[PDB]
Design a protein around this ligand. Structure first.
Ligand SMILES: *[C@@H]1O[C@H](CO)[C@@H](O[C@@H]2O[C@H](CO)[C@@H](O)[C@H](O)[C@H]2NC(C)=O)[C@H](O)[C@H]1NC(C)=O
Ligand SMILES: *[C@@H]1O[C@H](CO)[C@@H](O)[C@H](O)[C@H]1NC(C)=O
Ligand SMILES: *[C@@H]1O[C@H](CO)[C@@H](O)[C@H](O)[C@H]1NC(C)=O
Lengths: 50, 50
């Protein structure tokens, strides 16, 4: 799904990945130490899986 | 030998039958295969797919 649309869904930074979750309908794939920092500074995002 | 022509070898000999074997090979096995959903379907991508 991602290699078909590398222009569309893949981003350049963590910051541009969070802004597309906040605005668009998107499921950005971070690393678990910067999901814990985002979900304290912004209480409207969450960590889905394990 | 002849400087205009080159080596006109009269090689063309029989003293012993041919060295090992001849070549039977790959043949690439062409497959008659239509496109149809999820058996055989095209890929969509950004860069050209050939
Ligand atoms: C409440 O639900 C709405 C819609 O389901 C969401 O807010 C908007 O979601 C759309 C996605 O279709 C975005 O384009 C908008 O930018 C969102 N609005 C804002 C202000 O960002 C969201 O799920 C919830 N909105 C909240 C909690 O404010
Ligand atoms: C999450 O987004 C909403 C609306 O976009 C806004 O209240 C704020 O940016 C966030 N919520 C909280 C509690 O910080
Ligand atoms: C090579 O020699 C043979 C022997 O008769 C001749 O027939 C032929 O014309 C010559 N030249 C080439 C290019 O084969």
């Amino acid at each position: 799904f991602m290699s078909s649309r590398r222009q569309s869904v893949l981003v350049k930074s963590n910051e541009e990945g969070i802004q597309r979750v906040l605005t668009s309908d998107y499921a950005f794939l971070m690393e678990s130490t910067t999901i814990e920092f985002v979900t304290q500074r912004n209480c409207n995002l969450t960590q889905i899986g394990g | 030998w002849d400087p205009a022509s080159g080596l006109n070898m009269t090689e063309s000999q029989k003293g012993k039958p041919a060295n090992i074997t001849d070549s039977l090979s790959n043949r690439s096995l062409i497959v008659t295969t239509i496109l149809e959903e999820p058996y055989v379907l095209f890929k969509k991508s950004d860069k050209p797919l050939y």
